[PDB]
Amino acid sequence: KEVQSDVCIVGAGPAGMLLGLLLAKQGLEVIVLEQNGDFHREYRGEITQPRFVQLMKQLNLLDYIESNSHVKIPEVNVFHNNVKIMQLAFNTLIDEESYCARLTQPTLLSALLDKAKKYPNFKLLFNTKVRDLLREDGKVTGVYAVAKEGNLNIKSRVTVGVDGRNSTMEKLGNFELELDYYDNDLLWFSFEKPESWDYNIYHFYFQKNYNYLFLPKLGGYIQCGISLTKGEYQKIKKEGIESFKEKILEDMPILKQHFDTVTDFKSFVQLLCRMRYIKDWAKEEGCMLIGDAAHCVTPWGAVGSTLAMGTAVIAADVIYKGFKNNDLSLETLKQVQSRRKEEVKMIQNLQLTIEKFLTREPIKKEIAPLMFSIATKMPDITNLYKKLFTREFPLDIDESFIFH
Amino acid sequence: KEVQSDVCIVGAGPAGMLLGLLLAKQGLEVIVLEQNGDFHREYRGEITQPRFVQLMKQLNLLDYIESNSHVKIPEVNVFHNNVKIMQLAFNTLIDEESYCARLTQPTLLSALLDKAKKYPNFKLLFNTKVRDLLREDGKVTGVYAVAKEGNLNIKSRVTVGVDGRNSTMEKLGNFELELDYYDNDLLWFSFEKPESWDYNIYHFYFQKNYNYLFLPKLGGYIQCGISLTKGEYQKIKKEGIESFKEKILEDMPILKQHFDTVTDFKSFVQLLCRMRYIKDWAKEEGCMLIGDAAHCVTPWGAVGSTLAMGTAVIAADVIYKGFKNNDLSLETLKQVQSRRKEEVKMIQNLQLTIEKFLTREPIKKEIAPLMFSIATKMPDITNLYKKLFTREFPLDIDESFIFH
Amino acid sequence: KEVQSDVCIVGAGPAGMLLGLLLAKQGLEVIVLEQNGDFHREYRGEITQPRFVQLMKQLNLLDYIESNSHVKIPEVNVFHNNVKIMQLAFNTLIDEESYCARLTQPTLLSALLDKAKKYPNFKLLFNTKVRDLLREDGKVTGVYAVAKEGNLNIKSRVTVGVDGRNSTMEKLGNFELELDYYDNDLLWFSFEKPESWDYNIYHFYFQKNYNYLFLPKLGGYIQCGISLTKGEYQKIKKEGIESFKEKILEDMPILKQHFDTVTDFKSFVQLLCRMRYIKDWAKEEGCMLIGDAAHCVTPWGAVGSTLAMGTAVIAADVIYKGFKNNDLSLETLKQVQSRRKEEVKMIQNLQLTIEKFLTREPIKKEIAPLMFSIATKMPDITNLYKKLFTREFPLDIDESFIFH
Ligand SMILES: Cc1cc2nc3c(=O)[nH]c(=O)nc-3n(C[C@H](O)[C@H](O)[C@H](O)COP(=O)(O)OP(=O)(O)OC[C@H]3O[C@@H](n4cnc5c(N)ncnc54)[C@H](O)[C@@H]3O)c2cc1C
Ligand SMILES: Cc1cc2nc3c(=O)[nH]c(=O)nc-3n(C[C@H](O)[C@H](O)[C@H](O)COP(=O)(O)OP(=O)(O)OC[C@H]3O[C@@H](n4cnc5c(N)ncnc54)[C@H](O)[C@@H]3O)c2cc1C
Ligand SMILES: Cc1cc2nc3c(=O)[nH]c(=O)nc-3n(C[C@H](O)[C@H](O)[C@H](O)COP(=O)(O)OP(=O)(O)OC[C@H]3O[C@@H](n4cnc5c(N)ncnc54)[C@H](O)[C@@H]3O)c2cc1C
Ligand SMILES: CCCCCC/C=C\CCCCCCCC(=O)O[C@H](COC(=O)CCCCCCC/C=C/CCCCCCCC)COP(=O)(O)OC[C@H](O)CO
Ligand SMILES: CCCCCC/C=C\CCCCCCCC(=O)O[C@H](COC(=O)CCCCCCC/C=C\CCCCCCCC)COP(=O)(O)OC[C@H](O)CO
Ligand SMILES: CCCCCC/C=C\CCCCCCCC(=O)O[C@H](COC(=O)CCCCCCC/C=C\CCCCCCCC)COP(=O)(O)OC[C@H](O)CO
């Protein structure tokens, strides 16, 4: 059918969903579309940042978010050859409360949906794959989508895409990619937590054969990612499962119990560490790109979700200002990028610098952990930690967006 | 009065001058405006790069330029506490001709002008500072300038600004700065060459107090740049000339003879190591920013002039193609940036990495040279050399640009 | 025959000898057996630590030992390509007197023997090589040895093995060895001291071909050790003496006068840099392994003798406590290991980290020296110096062990 509204957010991710309710409490007609059936269809990570806590307290949602199931990671540890080389507790970064949080994306999305659906002007449609844009009169008037019931021409003055790195809307509008980075990947597998370890951990190991990352998998497990170069996993698959198991157990002898029942490669998940940046997030009238669709980043420090959420809150700010001033021009849509540009670019440069440490070249794989140990012992490093984990000042938002 | 041409180039530096004649030999009408009375008025540099040799040989200009006054520099040396830690002969980078050169901008510009003025369709005006842009019918039509003898209203299909880092057309057209970096400065002074030293040198020194750069100043002298942090030269002036002289002679005792007659700071010249990148070099029809006005860089590797010249060559190719096809809109003008983007950005990122070694912070200052040594002993380092000093492939340009 | 006492110490090296007299003044019955004829038979080193001085002045023995012949080494220097990269004066590590000391093991052992022989309950037998343990009634009750006159069945409640790395009692009791490290060796030779050098030196040199160590050999000479990889010595011997001499003199031209008279490999002495750690030093009643037989280490920093002496002091404390308490079970003998474990493991890990600098691999050999320079320029290097050279707190022992 034909339904008309004010804001159409393609994608029900953590960003759009946030952008879903921030406008919903402002009295705007909001429709949020997702192609999936729910938030459980795809696993998009669990670890968050102290920046997330900062934003939740800034929006006065910290207590409501904390009431759900979560785990507080107090610090991050880096080991070299099973010897600790760096330690950083998140509570020393800012005076207020700060901590990493194992908080599943489905649970946070469910909480946001529960809070948002109390507003009648909010409509969330699942199983709705957007097909194209109603680019009419030289501007984006709405979107043509298929609901699965029928075909919808859903019109809105603003159409915002948060479709993630695998965004179809990136090419529906002529959005030019000015940064496409893909150099490494991760091999994820979950194993039962050993009794010698803690559950609330955030660990990175430099070892002889591979580099490892250990995170608190939901349910009392430990979720470990092995860092590999792009195009190296199929070489390992050809080389044989036995060699991979031997090289892993030589590096991490405690994984022997889990690998005793491992005999093949299909228990691992290949995560592609992609990073992207759109040349201009808004270039037409009524269309703009925020979230992972525009500034997706690598999962080092768990900054991607918080970055998307901050960009979504800035976009809600700009959209509300445009509605109040009756000025939703494209130059108003440039404001979102002009405000998030410094944060996003600084974060992306930090991620590039961190990814430089993951080199697996003959001499560089051996000099990287020592380089990391030198870098973490500089007196400046603390500031860098803040640049990577906290927002120095809260995002300038109107007091109307604060929840009570 | 009323002067009508095809191309109007504001700026007669090495880039525009090249763009001045590359189109001039194509048969187009070219007018080049310069505020200075000659090329000798400002000192704009001496050192070139093997990229310059590659570009000259590609255009079949190498013999003509090499017939002038130049000094071939075969290698760059780096020292730590007066002990060499790095060496690189340029002839090993590529199989063709590869060498740095001492070549003053005035003589290169004089050679280019001598070649260009033989074409009747090329005109050059000196002491003609551009004031306004003749923006009419929603597009840039020409420039209003003052010649010192009258007020000229020059009309041309293409108006190209190569004004340099201190560009007046940078704001006449609303051009945005995507990057603006300024972290260090160079204190330049020339001293007579000691008999122990060679003339065709390119030397860098990590010393106790200051880092030094030595280049062959024209006339049998040696020009030295002392690297300082931004805003630190005033502190040095306050502290006194005697302390500065003592710390300089402690680092480099060979400078004693020159400093025997230095009693004040009015002989050193301060250079601001600014690096800039324009968001989009073409944003209006009939106007464009290329060269140092768009992608000015730091003087680490002598890449600035060659980069500007390559941008000018690509711009000449694009402009000639557009004139041939009778299509000089904004879309075709936006091709120069797309064709120079990756090279310019890679060079700027390498410059940022190199400038990271110039830190004067308490702890980082003493380990920075050693880091540099570790950098120069990597197996990959030679590729980096090829990325910094040479061009992998010649510029994709039409055959009529080759001189005979 | 039949000899019955309290303590039987197999081995009369610096550790056991110390524990030989510490218990002797407690009134216990002690026999110390040594297979050698005297303390001059085997060269066991000359360099001590400030830790040794701390231990000697803790027992009120510093003035007695210092009355002998010794050379005070005030500092340790590290050079790279004949240029000093590190300096450390030991007196800045603790407020008390702190220095290294060239003190020949025969001299210290003779002083300890002279102090101990005044006690009639102390008996030392040279040329009495132990052969077996009298393990009876499910526990060790003594030793069967041969004195060169007769066969001695020595009976003692406590039997302590300090036989060293070549321990013959290491396998008499099934002592599990949980760390067997051997990666490098040292080629030792003594040469006449040049007048340009100081005698009391502790010098390390990173050079082009080999790494060198210079110590004050007794008699006004200089003891030099060339660091080599395991098994490389016989490759050098096959390659020829002349090539070895040329590569040595290229690295250290000051050695030309000594190497003018060198024409064979029979002047150098090969020392194997082994480092062992027994899993548990006490596993049954009436037997124990301490000292070099338990925690042998590499000779970097001169830590082995002081570590063995400290272990012997702790073992004497535990043995006296058990004898006074009348409790000499396995669980009270485990106290020595439980108390020395942290110190010994910290020292051994530091030795591993130091030995990592002695790599001779193609590219790693060149970045190792200036990797050493970086680590010595860290803000926390002084804590590492204190941990590697000094003891933070004195060993907790009774006043009865203090000499008067
Ligand atoms: C496999 C994986 C693992 C990750 N792990 C972590 C981690 O451990 N820690 C961390 O901090 N971050 C992690 N991330 C990143 C994190 O998920 C993102 O930063 C976050 O999702 C940002 O929100 P978003 O809405 O922009 O992205 P997404 O939530 O991924 O946006 C995509 C959403 O839009 C919908 N959609 C897409 N296209 C369409 C369309 N055409 N029509 C309709 N709906 C559409 C999808 O159904 C989905 O709901 C991970 C991401 C992935 C892909
Ligand atoms: C002190 C100094 C030293 C340098 N040393 C080196 C070096 O050793 N090596 C190296 O590789 N690079 C060096 N450079 C950089 C190098 O000079 C530039 O990168 C290069 O000239 C770029 O070419 P261009 O024509 O775009 O710039 P420019 O040479 O600056 O060209 C701009 C010209 O246009 C004129 N102009 C500006 N505005 C107007 C206007 N409104 N109307 C009319 N004319 C106008 C200017 O007067 C100037 O003549 C140095 C620069 C400086 C300032
Ligand atoms: C060549 C060399 C150079 C060294 N240089 C230094 C140095 O510069 N600085 C430093 O701090 N350390 C040095 N050391 C190490 C130092 O000698 C030992 O760490 C130290 O002696 C430890 O004390 P210990 O008595 O347990 O060892 P040792 O003195 O080696 O113990 C062996 C003793 O036990 C006796 N013994 C062994 N087996 C039997 C048996 N079956 N029956 C009877 N007696 C037996 C031997 O006769 C000898 O007296 C060096 C060692 C060597 C081999
Ligand atoms: C080399 C033979 C010995 C020569 C010395 C002779 C006798 C005595 C002097 C002993 C000095 C030994 C210095 C050891 C330095 C060292 O590695 O210690 C470290 C130094 O601290 C650092 O982490 C600083 C940077 C460390 C750099 C890596 C050092 C270990 C690596 C060795 C390999 C070197 C060759 C290169 C191989 C790899 C190339 C591909 C201890 O660190 P920590 O975490 O315990 O504490 C921090 C510290 O206090 C600084 O803040
Ligand atoms: C490797 C993955 C990391 C695993 C844990 C991830 C999760 C949490 C931990 C987060 C902490 C990460 C911080 C690492 C330190 C770091 O990036 O430092 C850097 C230090 O400075 C830099 O810019 C370093 C440049 C990039 C270094 C690349 C690493 C080189 C390693 C191996 C390849 C060897 C080839 C080079 C050898 C030559 C040496 C120079 C941050 O720089 P900055 O300018 O942003 O800030 C500087 C700072 O404030 C003080 O200098
Ligand atoms: C220093 C001023 C310039 C002096 C030279 C003058 C003229 C010409 C010579 C130019 C030679 C420049 C080469 C410098 C090395 C360099 O850029 O390498 C780098 C090597 O890798 C890096 O990114 C190194 C990190 C950047 C430098 C960090 C700053 C180090 C100094 C001080 C801060 C110390 C704390 C931070 C430590 C970080 C761990 C390394 C470029 O990386 P890449 O991936 O592009 O290339 C890899 C390469 O093949 C391996 O090295």
SS3 percent helix, strand, coil of chain A, rounded to 5, is 35, 25, 35
**Cα B89 to Cα B40, B77, B222, B372, distances in angstroms:** 31, 9, 20, 18
Flag if C373 and B374 touch (Cβ within 8 Å). Answer: no
C381 lies within 8 A of chain B by CB: no
CB B29 within 8 Å of CB B120: no
* Cβ atoms of A348 and A179 closer than 8 Å: yes
SS3 A276: strand
Binary contact (A377, C374; C-beta < 8 A): no
Expressed in angstroms and rounded, the spacing between residue C170 Cα and the centre of ligand 3 is 14
| Cα–Cα dist C346/C277, whole Å | 12
- Cβ–Cβ of A374/C378 closer than 8 Å? yes
Q: What is the DSSP letter of A160?
A: E
The residue whose C-alpha atom lies closest to atom 52 belonging to ligand 3 is: C44
Question: C74 in ligand 3 pocket by Cβ < 6 Å?
Answer: no
Which tokens belong to C109?
Answer: 């052992």
Beta pairing partners, B142: B155
Closest chain B residue to A375, measured at CA? B364
The residue behind tokens 């070895």 is C244
Q: Chains touching chain C at 3 or more Cβ pairs under 8 angstroms?
A: A, B
- Residue A371: closest CA among chain B residues belongs to which residue? B371
Q: Please say whether the beta carbons of C119 and C32 come within 8 A.
A: no
DSSP for A107-138 reads HHHHHHHHHHTTSTTEEEESSEEEEEEEEETT
What are residue A295's phi and psi, to 5 degrees? Answer: -140, 45
Cα–Cα distance list, B378 to B214, B347, C115, C379 (Å)? 25, 20, 59, 27
Closest CA relative to residue C307, chosen from C354, C271, C345: C345
Q: How far apart are CA C139 and CA C159, in angstroms?
A: 11
* Interface check A366 vs C, CB under 8 A: yes
Q: How many residues does chain C have?
A: 404
Whether B363 contacts chain A with CB within 8 A? yes
HEC per residue, chain C: CEEEEEEEEECCCHHHHHHHHHHHCCCCCEEEECCCCCCCCCCCCCECCHHHHHHHHHCCCHHHHHCCCCEEECEEEEEECCEEEEEEEHHHCCCCCCCEEECCHHHHHHHHHHHHCCCCCEEEECCEEEEEEEEECCEEEEEEEEECCEEEEEEEEEEEECCCCCCCCCCCCCCCEEEEEEEEEEEEEEEECCCCCCCCCCEEEECCCCEEEEECCCCCEEEEEEEEECCHHHHHHHHCHHHHHHHHHHHCHHHHHHHCCCCCCCCCEEEEEEEEEECCCCCCCCEEECCHHHHCCCCCCCCHHHHHHHHHHHHHHHHHHHHHHCCCCHHHHHHHHHHHHHHHHHHHHHHHHHHHHHCCCCCHHHHHHHHHHHHCCCCCHHHHHHHHHCCCCCCCCCHHHCCC
Task: In whole angstroms, give the CA distance from residue A128 to residue B367.
Answer: 57
Is the separation of the CB atoms in A100 and A49 below 8 Å? yes
- With a 6 Å cutoff on the Cβ, whether B315 touches ligand 6 is no
Question: How many residues does the structure list for chain B?
Answer: 404
The answer to whether A379 faces chain C, any CB pair under 8 Å, is yes
CA angle B294, B45, B126 (to 5 degrees): 70
Rounded-to-integer distance, Cα C125 and Cα B270, Å? 82
Altogether, the residues listed in chain A come to a count of 404
Only one residue has tokens 């080999």, namely C210
The burial class, CB within 10 Å (0-12 / 13-18 / 19+), for B212 is buried
Establish if A138 touches chain B: CB-CB under 8 angstroms: no
Q: How far is C373 from chain B (nearest CA, A)?
A: 8
Q: Is the dihedral of CA B186, B187, B192, B196 positive or negative?
A: negative
| Minimal CA separation from C193 to chain B, in Å | 28
Task: List the beta bridge partners of residue A255.
Answer: none
Residue A119 makes CB contacts below 8 A (sequence gap 6+) with: A21, A24, A25
Report the alpha-carbon distance of residue A228 to residue A273 in Å, rounded.
Answer: 10
- For C:69-108, CB contacts with B below 8 A are 81, 83
Task: Determine how many CB atoms are found less than 10 A away from the CB of residue B361.
Answer: 12
CATH class of the domain at C2-179+274-393: alpha beta
Print the SS3 string covering chain B: CCEECCEEEECCCHHHHHHHHHCHHHCCCEEEECCCCCCCCCCCCCEECHHHHHHHHHCCCHHHHHCCCCEEECEEEEEECCEEEEEEEHHHCCCCCCCEEECCHHHHHHHHHHHHCCCCCEEEECCEEEEEEEEECCEEEEEEEEECCEEEEEECCEEEECCCCCCCHHHHCCCCEEEEEEEEEEEEEEEECCCCCCCCCCEEEECCCCEEEEECCCCCEEEEEEEEECCCHHHHHHHCHHHHHHHHHHHCHHHHHHHCCCCCCCCCEEEEEEEEEECCCCCCCCEEECCHHHHCCCCCCCCHHHHHHHHHHHHHHHHHHHHHHCCCCHHHHCHHHHHHHHHHHHHHHHHHHHHHHHCCCCCHHHHHHHHHHHHHCCCCHHHHHHHHHCCCCCCCCCHHHCCC
Give me the half-sphere count of Cα atoms (radius 13 Å) on the Cβ side of residue A286.
19
Whether the CB of B363 is below 8 Å from some CB of chain C: the reply is yes
Of all atoms in ligand 5, which is nearest to the CA of residue A349?
A: 45
Distance CA B318, CA B23 (A): 10
Nearest-CA residue for atom 18 of ligand 3: C305
Mutate: best of A179, A380, A381, A383, partner B, most B CBs <10 A = A380
In whole angstroms, give the CA distance from residue B356 to residue B275.
14
The DSSP call for residue A400 is G
Considering only the top CATH level, what class is B3-72+96-178+274-401? Answer: alpha beta
B146 forms beta bridges with B129, B151
CATH assignment of A2-178+274-393, among 3.40.50.300, 3.90.1150.10, 3.50.50.60, 1.10.3720.10 = 3.50.50.60
Q: How far is A57 from chain C (nearest CA, A)?
A: 37
C66 burial via Cβ count (<10 Å: 0-12, 13-18, 19+)? middle
CA distance C72 to C77: 15
Pocket test for ligand 5, best of A371, A378, A386, A390 (most atoms within 8 A of CB): A371
- Quote the ligand 6 centre to B375 CA distance (angstroms): 6
Assess contact for C251 and C210: CB atoms under 8 A.
yes
Cβ–Cβ below 8 Å for A374 and B367: yes
Tell me whether C379 touches chain B (CB under 8 Å). yes
Q: Is A230 helix (H, G, I), strand (E, B) or coil?
A: coil
| Positive or negative: CA dihedral C235, C238, C239, C242 | positive
CA distance A154 to C300: 76
Q: Which two tokens stand for residue B89?
A: 């002969």
Among B32, B24, B286, CA closest to B147: B32
The answer to whether residue C362 neighbours chain B at the CB level (below 8 Å) is no
Across-strand partners of B356?
none
Distance between CA atoms of residues B359 and A375, nearest Å: 14
**Is residue A116 within 8 Å of A124, Cβ to Cβ?**
yes
Under an 8 A CB cutoff, do A378 and B363 touch?
yes
Chain B: partners with 3+ C-beta pairs within 8 Å = A, C
Is there an atom of ligand 4 within 6 Å of C304 CB? no
Verify whether ligand 6 is closer than 6 Å to residue B368 (CB atom): yes
The pair phi, psi for residue C134, each rounded to 5°, is -85, 65
Q: Give the distance from residue C349's alpha carbon to the nearest chain A alpha carbon, in angstroms.
A: 10
Q: Which tokens sit at C245?
A: 């001499």
B302, two tokens: 């002598």
Nearest to A363 among B361, B362, B379 (CB): B379
List beta partners, residue B180. Answer: B276
Q: Is C383 on the interface with A (CB under 8 A)?
A: no
Chain B, chain C: beta-carbon pairs less than 8 Å apart? 24
* Contact state of C378 with A377 under an 8 Å Cβ cutoff: yes
C88 DSSP β-pair partners: C76
Chain A: nearest CA to B215, how far in angstroms? 32
For residue A67, the surrounding DSSP H or E stretch is none
Contacts with A232 (C-beta within 8 Å, 6 or more apart), sequence order? A185, A360
In ligand 5, the atom with minimum distance to the C-alpha of A76 is: 8
Which chain A residue's Cα is nearest to B362? A379
Determine the Cα–Cα distance for residues B281 and B277; give it in Å rounded to an integer: 9
Q: How was this structure determined?
A: cryo-EM
Chain A neighbours (≥3 Cβ pairs under 8 A) are: B, C
Sign of CA dihedral C32, C36, C40, C44: negative
DSSP-based three-state secondary structure for A3 = strand
Where are the domains positioned within chain A? 2-178+274-393
Q: Is A380 on the interface with B (CB under 8 A)?
A: yes
